[PDB]
Amino acid sequence: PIFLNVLEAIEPGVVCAGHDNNQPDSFAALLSSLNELGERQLVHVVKWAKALPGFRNLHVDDQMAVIQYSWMGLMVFAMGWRSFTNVNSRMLYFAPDLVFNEYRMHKSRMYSQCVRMRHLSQEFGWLQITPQEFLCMKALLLFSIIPVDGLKNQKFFDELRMNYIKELDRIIACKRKNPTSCSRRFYQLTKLLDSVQPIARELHQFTFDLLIKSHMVSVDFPEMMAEIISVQVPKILSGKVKPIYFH
């Protein structure tokens, strides 16, 4: 289980938002902490992605771009798993110090998106996603959104993605002799993985609008995150960069 030993070994630990929870909830503070949190997680997504088998093969420029494009989707997936294992989908476990109840979902003005992520969180339980299927699906998520104009070296990316899909195949085949059994499972996971994209899109849209009017709502965007949003998010929303759906 060399591949899975690696995925487990590099899985990031707990990341806290640094949110002041004894302060009454406000849009400005919740979002400022979500932005800070988002940034704190990116630091781990980068160290995590670079330690992934074969990731180093990608061209240095594709590595960064791929991490940036899939940044939202990867967080969504990991947050839903956290919400499932930690609180049973009762709330959204963004971080230990940033747990969202419906009231917070509403105040953040990302209610539609939150309810969708809560549903994703319930899927982990309904589908009985094992900790290993989770790890392999998350890795595959990093290789699921590319530029229509192509990466600097599109071929290496294609090979890499195909190998991650093959690993998922193995995890599914592990303890499933019936081919029909493996098929139904692949269908379910690929379907669950696609469902992450529409959520990421809505979150991307929300983040884009929020940045443009950041100054009017007193939200504080980290210097690094603002730059990445202004350069990368529009490519996604305008259709230049698109996610790879299975279905």
Residue nearest to ligand B68 (CB): 79
Feature table: binding site for 17beta-hydroxy-5alpha-androstan-3-one: 35, 82, 207
Residues 48-87: x where in contact with ligand B68 by CB under 6 A, - otherwise, as a string: --------------------xx-xx--xx--x--------
Q: Measured between alpha carbons, how far is 171 from 118 in angstroms, rounded to an integer?
A: 26
As given in the structure block, the two tokens for residue 247 are 């279905």
Q: Report CA-CA distances (Å) from 187 to 146, 182, 246.
A: 22, 9, 9
Interface with ligand B68 includes 136 (CB under 6 A)?
no
Which of 29, 38, 49, 118 forms a contact with ligand B68 (CB under 6 A)?
38
Q: What is the nearest approach in angstroms of ligand B68 to the Cβ of residue 150?
A: 18
User: Which of these segments, 135-143, 165-173, 186-194, 227-235, binds ligand B68 (CB under 6 A)?
Assistant: 227-235
Distance from chain centroid for Cα 88: 19
Q: Which residues of 144-161 are buried (b: 16+ CB within 10 A; e: fewer)?
A: bbbbeeebeeeeebeebb
Feature table: binding site: 35, 82, 207
As given in the structure block, the two tokens for residue 179 are 């081919």
Which of 30, 37, 58, 146 forms a contact with ligand B68 (CB under 6 A)?
37
Q: Measured between alpha carbons, how far is 44 from 12 in angstroms, rounded to an integer?
A: 6
Total number of residues binding ligand B68 (CB under 6 A)?
Answer: 20
Interface with ligand B68 includes 193 (CB under 6 A)?
no
Which of 29, 30, 34, 193 forms a contact with ligand B68 (CB under 6 A)?
34
Continuous H helices in 127-244:
131-142, 154-173, 179-194, 196-212, 214-217, 223-237
User: Which of these segments, 3-11, 36-44, 121-129, 173-181, binds ligand B68 (CB under 6 A)?
Assistant: 36-44
Interface with ligand B68 includes 172 (CB under 6 A)?
no
| CA atoms within 13 Å, Cβ hemisphere of 236 | 30
Which of 81, 164, 232, 243 forms a contact with ligand B68 (CB under 6 A)?
232
Nearest to 59 by CA among 187, 140, 146, 127: 146
As given in the structure block, the two tokens for residue 166 are 């093959």
Interface with ligand B68 includes 41 (CB under 6 A)?
yes
Name the residues that contact ligand B68, by CB under 6 A. 34-35, 37-38, 41, 68-69, 71-72, 75-76, 79, 94, 203, 207, 225, 228-229, 232-233
